[PDB]
Design an enzyme around this catalytic site. Structure first.
Site, short mmCIF file in Angstrom:
data_model
loop_
_atom_site.label_atom_id
_atom_site.label_comp_id
_atom_site.label_asym_id
_atom_site.label_seq_id
_atom_site.Cartn_x
_atom_site.Cartn_y
_atom_site.Cartn_z
N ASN A 156 0.84 -1.19 0.00
CA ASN A 156 0.00 0.00 0.00
C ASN A 156 0.88 1.24 0.00
O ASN A 156 1.95 1.27 0.60
CB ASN A 156 -0.92 -0.01 1.22
CG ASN A 156 -1.83 -1.22 1.24
OD1 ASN A 156 -2.35 -1.61 0.21
ND2 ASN A 156 -2.01 -1.81 2.40
N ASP A 216 -0.46 4.49 0.62
CA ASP A 216 -1.25 5.58 1.15
C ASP A 216 -0.82 6.02 2.55
O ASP A 216 -1.37 6.99 3.08
CB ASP A 216 -2.76 5.18 1.12
CG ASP A 216 -3.03 3.85 1.81
OD1 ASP A 216 -2.66 3.68 3.00
OD2 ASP A 216 -3.61 2.98 1.14
N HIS A 265 6.13 -0.62 -2.49
CA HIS A 265 5.76 0.13 -3.69
C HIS A 265 5.99 1.63 -3.55
O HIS A 265 5.61 2.38 -4.45
CB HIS A 265 4.31 -0.16 -4.04
CG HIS A 265 4.11 -1.53 -4.58
ND1 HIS A 265 2.88 -2.11 -4.75
CD2 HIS A 265 5.02 -2.46 -4.98
CE1 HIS A 265 3.03 -3.33 -5.23
NE2 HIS A 265 4.31 -3.57 -5.38
N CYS A 281 18.07 13.82 -10.79
CA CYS A 281 19.12 13.52 -9.82
C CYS A 281 18.81 12.30 -8.95
O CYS A 281 19.68 11.87 -8.18
CB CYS A 281 19.39 14.74 -8.93
SG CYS A 281 18.11 15.20 -7.77
N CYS A 290 19.24 21.54 -9.43
CA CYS A 290 18.67 20.44 -10.21
C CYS A 290 17.45 20.90 -11.00
O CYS A 290 17.54 21.00 -12.23
CB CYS A 290 18.34 19.24 -9.33
SG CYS A 290 17.71 17.93 -10.36
N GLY A 303 -5.30 -8.91 4.41
CA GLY A 303 -5.88 -8.09 3.38
C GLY A 303 -5.40 -8.47 2.01
O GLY A 303 -5.40 -7.64 1.10
N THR A 304 -4.95 -9.71 1.86
CA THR A 304 -4.57 -10.24 0.57
C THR A 304 -4.38 -11.74 0.72
O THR A 304 -4.48 -12.31 1.81
CB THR A 304 -3.31 -9.59 0.02
OG1 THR A 304 -3.13 -10.02 -1.34
CG2 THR A 304 -2.10 -9.97 0.88
N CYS A 316 -10.22 -7.49 8.03
CA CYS A 316 -9.09 -7.34 8.94
C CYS A 316 -9.45 -6.52 10.16
O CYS A 316 -8.98 -6.80 11.27
CB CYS A 316 -7.94 -6.68 8.18
SG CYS A 316 -7.55 -7.71 6.79
ZN ZN Z 1 16.62 16.62 -8.81
#
Ligand code: ZN
Length: 262
Positions: free
Chosen positions: A106, A108, A123, A134, A177, A214-215, A253
């Site tokens: 997740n 979030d 993730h 950069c 940058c 949850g999976t 859950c």
């Molecule tokens: Zn940068």
């Protein structure tokens, strides 16, 4: 596979290094849209259409609109009882010298918002940027992330592209940058961060108890993790809303975890 809560609690009372693999169900119980399942769309797209390097390459404004929407949406969402049971579990056991680690797909940050400190976000996060020049990774909770995206990202089918020029999309603030930021999230077709994978593998190697919440243990990403834990003889307990490892507890859950992790 056993559904004996009381047997699971006997293992749980003795566990010193618990791995908790957290999947999308934990987020769906907080009302967080995933844009993945049947019916899960943002305008005319799903995540697999926009969470891709190619999509960001061809239409970065559209992809940023998508992710801007998902950031701002979080201002009205809260961790559920599953999040809380997991964070409270880490806190309590930490005072006893016992380790709890959450490995989540997740993005979030509801685990963090619930108080989890030992978190592996495999993730990435809605609330981190990465500079495509950069490579610097930074926290970003600014509402809106840039001025041009204020009021953009509407999800209704029929909303037009904001078509923001790439220069007015979120830019790197590192001195010298100024490149184009992307969401620091793993897209479809992309490698997981190898340092994260290495940390994941160390936790899977040392744990004496593994939770999959949850999976399903049998699908990405938990399929990458639970089998080698189960192969060493470590009990694996699954908490999801399927109707079918040592344990499977059916239900949200937020209903089962508070009891299981008490
Ligand atoms: Zn940068």
């Amino acid at each position: 596979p056993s559904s004996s809560m009381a047997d699971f609690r006997k293992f749980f009372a003795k566990a010193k290094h618990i791995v908790i693999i957290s999947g999308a169900g934990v987020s769906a119980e907080s009302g967080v849209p995933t844009f993945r399942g049947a019916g899960g769309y943002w305008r005319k797209w799903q995540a697999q259409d926009l969470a891709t390097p190619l999509a960001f390459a061809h239409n970065p404004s559209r992809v940023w609109e998508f992710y801007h929407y998902r950031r701002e949406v979080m201002g009205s969402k809260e961790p559920n009882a599953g999040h809380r049971a997991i964070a409270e579990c880490e806190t309590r056991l930490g005072k006893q010298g016992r380790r709890v680690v959450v490995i989540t797909q997740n993005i979030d940050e509801l685990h963090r918002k619930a108080g989890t400190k030992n978190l592996l976000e495999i993730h990435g996060s809605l609330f981190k940027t990465r500079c495509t020049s950069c490579g610097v990774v930074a926290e970003n909770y600014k509402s809106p992330i840039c001025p041009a995206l204020s009021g953009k990202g509407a999800p209704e089918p029929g909303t037009q592209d904001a078509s923001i020029p790439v220069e007015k999309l979120p830019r790197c603030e590192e001195a010298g940058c100024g490149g184009l930021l992307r969401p620091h999230v793993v897209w479809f077709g992309e490698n997981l961060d190898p340092a994260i994978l290495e940390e994941v593998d160390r936790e899977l190697a040392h744990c004496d108890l593994c939770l999959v919440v949850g999976t399903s243990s049998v699908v990405y990403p938990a399929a990458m993790f639970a089998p080698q834990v189960a192969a060493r003889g470590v009990p694996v307990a699954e908490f999801n809303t399927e109707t079918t490892f040592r344990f499977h507890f059916q239900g949200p859950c937020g209903t089962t975890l508070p009891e299981a992790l008490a």
